[PDB]
Write a protein that binds this ligand. Structure first.
Ligand SMILES: Nc1nc2c(ncn2[C@@H]2O[C@H](COP(=O)(O)O)[C@@H](O)[C@H]2O)c(=O)[nH]1
Length: 299
């Protein structure tokens, strides 16, 4: 499975989402079952490191990928599942230079993925909650535009949720024992107690995550601390980064290689390369159509 590095699967150009033919021929060739893990988030938040580490790459921490966008893929063998492939998706360029296909790229990632990894800096903020809410419903509207006819049946389709918090080497709070990353999640996910229309327009995203993301793991990561940029524009190695950061991101990878399920369609048919090509074309066609059937909401 040659793939030395990542490759764009869906490119964002002129506000126009175009699926990659070169990427589709690759997917087609892979007959084995797939575990799709989408590392989504804002640009320049350290997503690439999770990708390289997940792809098994030893030297995978770049330092400034200076310029002078869409969904990139990386198909490697699954390091804990022989006969299974690991497809890695990355939402490139989200909010970089900034119709704004950010939500759509976000949605396709969640759609195509078997596991959903949201990557953000600092403490959990409303802005993240709102778009997480927005994508949940957006994915509902797109998936529904593919169903043979014009709700515990949509929750079964949704991927697992993983939140990776970055530069949040802070994460210091407790009751009597220090909070775990997981406990921090539920905490920052606690609903506001108030019969108001400000707390209402605050608890909706929380309520949405409560229903649509049943399995939820959280990861807090330390600030990556390393030797100075010895001649700029390079790619460091683990032995040159904060040992804690390396161990944290490894413990993350381990959770992925073990807990992440094989991508399945409706009826429970495992998804393989050619099956993912179909899903990429279907979903790109459902979006690029500018159609979208207006059915009832799902919140
Ligand atoms: N703030 C922050 N940047 C990181 C971290 N890990 C890697 N980076 C940097 O963030 C950039 C990665 O961009 P990305 O893949 O999220 O679009 C690279 O320039 C890399 O040097 C991290 O944990 N926190």
């Amino acid at each position: 499975i040659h793939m030395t590095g990542p490759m764009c699967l869906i490119e964002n150009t002129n506000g126009r989402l175009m699926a990659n033919p070169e990427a589709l021929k690759i997917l087609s060739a892979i007959t084995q079952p797939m575990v799709v893990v989408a590392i989504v988030g804002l640009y320049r938040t350290g997503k690439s490191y999770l990708m390289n580490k997940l792809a098994g790459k030893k030297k995978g921490f770049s330092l400034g990928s200076t310029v002078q966008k869409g969904i990139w893929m990386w198909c490697v063998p699954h390091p804990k599942k022989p006969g299974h492939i690991l497809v890695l998706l990355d939402t490139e360029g989200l909010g970089d230079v900034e119709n704004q296909n950010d939500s759509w790229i976000f949605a396709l990632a969640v759609l195509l993925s078997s596991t959903f990894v949201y990557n953000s800096i600092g403490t959990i903020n409303q802005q993240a909650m709102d778009q997480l809410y927005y994508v949940t419903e957006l994915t509902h509207r797109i998936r529904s535009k593919s169903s043979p006819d014009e709700s515990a049946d949509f929750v079964s389709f949704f991927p697992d949720f993983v939140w990776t918090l970055r530069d949040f080497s802070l994460d210091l709070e407790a009751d009597g024992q220090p909070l775990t990353p997981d406990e921090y999640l539920t905490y920052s996910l606690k609903l506001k107690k108030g019969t108001s229309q400000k707390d209402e327009t605050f608890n909706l995203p929380r309520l949405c995550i409560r229903k649509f993301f049943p399995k939820k793991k959280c990861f807090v990561f330390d600030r990556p601390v390393h030797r100075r940029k010895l001649a700029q524009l390079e790619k460091l190695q683990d032995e040159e980064l904060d040992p804690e950061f390396v161990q944290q991101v490894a413990d993350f990878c381990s959770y992925i290689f073990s807990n992440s399920k094989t991508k399945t369609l409706s009826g429970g048919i495992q998804v393989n390369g050619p099956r993912l090509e179909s899903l990429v074309l279907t979903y790109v066609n459902a979006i690029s159509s500018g159609d979208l059937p207006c059915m009832e909401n799902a919140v």
